[PDB]
Design a protein around this nucleic acid. Structure first.
Ligand code: MG
Length: 99
DNA sequence: GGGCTGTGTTTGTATCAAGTTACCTGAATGGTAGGTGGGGAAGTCCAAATATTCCTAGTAAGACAATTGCATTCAAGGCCTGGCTGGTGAAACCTGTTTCCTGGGAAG
């Protein structure tokens, strides 16, 4: 067990999966902060909410990727309509028990 | 002559600290190798200190004049002291919450 946890596999994973598109908009949002960018107006982080139906991006810049900076960023966007599913990454701000 | 407040002397216990230690880790030491910093010796040049006089300006002084400063008296106001009332500050009790509090940890 000194040689099992250092050598890496020479066996690639198989074919990638293409999951199907949803059949309506407002079904899957794919959200991920970008940044730290170069600063402007006291902003560094930009929430990016892509619709999984189309590609229709939504931008909601914030000061710092906290939980509450995301929550008010979607209250603008939940004013439009309500999604069923929101995908993300396992972010520092999304995995919080508050969010 | 008397009085008031400060002061002192003695006791008990609670609290605070003194005590000794157990460990356990943090840190404190020992032995070494390396390079670097600094310390030391030198020199041409550099800046200040002196010896001088000279002249001049203001320093020093003597006189005078008048204001100010001082010392006293006057007048009363302001503040200190105390007899009193009560509203809050503090000490003891209880806690939930909040924040930290480094510390570790995950994830983008
Ligand atoms: Mg990301």
């Amino acid at each position: 067990q000194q040689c099992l946890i250092t050598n890496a596999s020479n066996k690639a994973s198989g074919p990638i999966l293409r999951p199907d598109r949803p059949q309506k908009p407002f079904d899957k949002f794919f959200i991920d902060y970008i940044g730290p960018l170069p600063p402007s107006q006291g902003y560094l982080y930009v929430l990016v909410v892509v619709d999984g139906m189309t590609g229709f991006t939504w931008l909601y810049p914030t000061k710092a990727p906290s939980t509450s900076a995301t929550v008010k960023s979607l209250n603008v966007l939940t004013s439009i309509a309500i999604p069923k599913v929101i995908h993300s990454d396992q972010g520092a701000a999304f995995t919080s028990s508050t969010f």
